[PDB]
Amino acid sequence: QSDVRIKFEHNGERRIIAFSRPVKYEDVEHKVTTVFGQPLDLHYMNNELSILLKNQDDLDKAIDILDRSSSMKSLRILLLSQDRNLEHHHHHH
């Protein structure tokens, strides 16, 4: 069992990206964040419950559930923009 296939969804668009284990949440975020840009939020949905990936702990929790399932092949991770960016320049007082 090598190469982790992760399916990312953004505004309906789908993308297939493979990862070589061991895979670190920090490393994945750095790569994904650059692909779609920043700042962005990582939303993970299993089926009935949804958990926001904040730390590596949440990352391993997702895999554990997937391993138990017979459909352990791809991952359903949806990322969405937080709407409105913070980058002011200048203004009158």
UniProtKB/Swiss-Prot annotation:
Cleavable signal peptide: none
Taxonomic superkingdom: Eukaryota
Domain PB1 residue range list: 3-82
Involvement in disease: Cerebral cavernous malformations 5: A form of cerebral cavernous malformations, a congenital vascular anomaly of the central nervous system that can result in hemorrhagic stroke, seizures, recurrent headaches, and focal neurologic deficits. The lesions are characterized by grossly enlarged blood vessels consisting of a single layer of endothelium and without any intervening neural tissue, ranging in diameter from a few millimeters to several centimeters.
Reported function: Component of a protein kinase signal transduction cascade. Mediates activation of the NF-kappa-B, AP1 and DDIT3 transcriptional regulators.
Family membership noted in the UniProt record: Belongs to the protein kinase superfamily. STE Ser/Thr protein kinase family. MAP kinase kinase kinase subfamily.
Assembly and interaction partners: Binds both upstream activators and downstream substrates in multimolecular complexes. Part of a complex with MAP2K3, RAC1 and CCM2. Interacts with MAP2K5 and SPAG9.
Name of the featured protein: Mitogen-activated protein kinase kinase kinase 3
Organism: Homo sapiens
